[PDB]
């Protein structure tokens, strides 16, 4: 339900830049990661009293 | 170049579940996060001598 990454372009990146295939579960993990980053972004934006999720609401520095 | 998240479905999630709009830069951050997670997955898979990026190669526990 609701794949949130562009599967074809992820597979293309991983193949072209890394010489690797991409498992189905890899796509699932990436999609779930996007969902969590979005929900956490909602939490951050609302806590600031805003109505728009902004780049500063997507905390990805631990990457 | 190469947006790696499904922009329409991200905006739909953020609006429907959080009542928020989604800025253009939010989409950019999410896309760059996916790119980094994929490249790091390539590093992990190759270090294990494999030819396929697997779910265990996408380290997202810091979420």
Numbering used by the authors:
A (entry chain A), B (entry chain A): 2 to 64
Sentences copied from the publication:
Here we report that histones are major chromatin components in the bacteria Bdellovibrio bacteriovorus and Leptospira interrogans. Crystal structures (<2.0 Å) of the B. bacteriovorus histone (Bd0055) dimer and the histone–DNA complex confirm conserved histone-fold topology but indicate a distinct DNA-binding mode. Unlike known histones in eukaryotes, archaea and viruses, Bd0055 binds DNA end-on, forming a sheath of dimers encasing straight DNA rather than wrapping DNA around their outer surface. The bacterial histone Bd0055 from B. bacteriovorus HD100 is structurally similar to its archaeal and eukaryotic homologues but, rather than wrapping DNA around its outer surface, binds DNA edge-on and oligomerizes to form a dense nucleohistone fibre that completely encases DNA in vitro.
We solved the crystal structure of Bd0055 to 1.8 Å resolution. Bd0055 forms a crystallographic dimer where one monomer is related to its partner through two-fold symmetry. It has the overall topology of a histone-fold dimer, as well as a positively charged ridge along its ‘top’ surface that is also found in archaeal and eukaryotic histones, where it is used for DNA binding. Of note, the Bd0055 α2 helix is 7 Å shorter than its archaeal and eukaryotic histone counterparts (1 helical turn shorter compared with archaeal HMfB), which decreases the overall size of the histone dimer. In addition, the α3 helix in Bd0055 forms only one helical turn and the remaining amino acids pack against α2 of the dimerization partner in an extended configuration. This organization differs from the three-turn α3 helix in archaeal/eukaryotic histones, which takes part in tetramerization by contributing to the four-helix bundle interface. A conserved histidine in α2 (H49) is conspicuously absent from bacterial histones. Finally, the surface opposite the basic ridge of the Bd0055 dimer is more acidic than that of HMf/HTk histones.
